[PDB]
């Protein structure tokens, strides 16, 4: 049990690095590995890694979480924030097991919007043990040479003593890279759903079949091992805000618009979501080679400024 | 970490009974509960509960595991061994979330035989992290007033250092009743799959979202807490031919379309391990169809099974 994700993350990284249960090479990928490993977080809103050597990218973090909320499988959205993700796209335009959005809101087993059913299940029966969003699908194993099979099995939500608890079940998790964004996204969905339900935040449990560090990540992982609060999302239904943020996300990503510090403050959005749009504008400055905006940076929560300053030190450091 | 399931079971039962995190009533069923709980078994073949006060039913245990291997959703098969299971059948003929058989071998998502795909996945890539049997289905929460929603999410198998390890992921588990037969069946499937693959047995990991004791079981649960012969190993190799023959006898004995004396059972053309399983079904047929109990049958069984039968049906085998 850990207070914040960062303590859990580093503890697990050290466990696998120094006392791996196995060294093997699934699909030819040499790894250190522990089996059946997990942790409990007391404060899931504190979901970020702030160790500078890790260079956690808070823009990618929100982009991935919002890509899920959009229900999209499209590669162009997410590859803008992480170009290497295209290696898991077989068709050059969509992702499969990596795209949790359609698994959540239109799962290929029946076209089901599972988030809606979870919300209704917990409204009719607050004590329910059934409020599960399934991610994995039985047909992913049916064809050989699938380059992108979902590694998350399911996400569960439970209301306990007025608080929404979350549990993520995964068959496998890259403990150095994937875990950072997976825990971010799952606790983001937990918090988003809690706000929608009008509840506080309970614990988050992460449970993983194979948790591993790729040998190709060892040097960076060693660097990380040798080495301010995350803001709370506003109460209530955040779907209207998410829709407006996604409109700005696409306009900024394609460089079809840009937002000054004053334009960002004038957005018709809660402050929390204004900061997310500001992160997309900062990212647009990087990607499309526009002037880094000192005023934008100064108005962000300190957690976000630090992430930006360490990730792109030439722009925001 | 525990050596055998019985140690894990009693430890967990004590945890939930004396130190529950929550007390609540999902779907109106008052319960003691802990969230996010599990254990590891170093020797999953030792999968049985022998505490006499528990009255663990080894006939049901094998029946449920073999019901799964048969791929069946039929209620008549399984309610014969556990009459109360009929409470979860909406149509009086089939089970839904309780019937893991069809989930394993012809899952509602595409009719996929996932056991074959897992075996093929692990044959092409022994180190695979993808060898998962999905149980739960997204449409189950869309059924209004669904009385039988799968509580197992998935089962995973991994070949690690020549041993087949298994992991059961559940969203919820009844720690008094369901855990006994779920861990039995899952470790049974693990061993069965390990024999087929020519591997030894590794650890079994059980991970559960809501682990709970229903208030209506509290009295029985403390009797168990207030209170060995070893479980036999399944034979090496592909056990599907034996399973097919055992399922033929299971159906004839359950419908009283056949019966076998102790000497007839000993002479069956089956490995000893499976002959004992057929003998358990013949003994159960003697109970449920009111035939003469065969004490000679009882004497030839492994002691673990003898104890189970003697405690469960003392008038017949006690
Ligand atoms: N959201 C994601 C997507 C992928 N992975 C990592 C863990 C998997 O082990 C690996 C995919 O390889 P495989 O399918 O062989 O497990 O990617 C992860 O940790 N989180
Ligand atoms: N193979 C099974 C089937 C059912 N259950 C128990 C756990 C569930 O919590 C409960 C079903 O109720 P619910 O759907 O509300 O969780 O039955 C179990 O432990 N193992």
Author numbering:
A (entry chain A): 5 to 231, 240 to 329
B (entry chain B): 5 to 231, 239 to 329
Give passages from the manuscript.
In this study, we demonstrated that MilA has a substrate preference for CMP (kcat/KM = 39.2 mM−1 min−1) over dCMP (kcat/KM = 7.84 mM−1 min−1), and thus offers an opportunity to investigate the mechanism by which conserved TS evolves the preference for ribosyl over 2′-deoxyribosyl groups. In the structures of apo MilA and its complexes with various substrates, MilA are all homodimers.
However, in MilA-dCMP, the 3′-hydroxyl group of dCMP forms one hydrogen bond with the Lys-133′ and another intramolecular hydrogen bond with the phosphate group. The main reason for this difference is that Ala176 in MilA is replaced by a serine, Ser167/Ser169, in TS/CH. Hence, MilA can not only can utilize CMP, but also can use dCMP as its substrate like CH and TS. The KM for CMP was 0.0719 mM, 3.4-fold lower than that for dCMP (KM = 0.245 mM), demonstrating that CMP was a better substrate than dCMP for MilA.
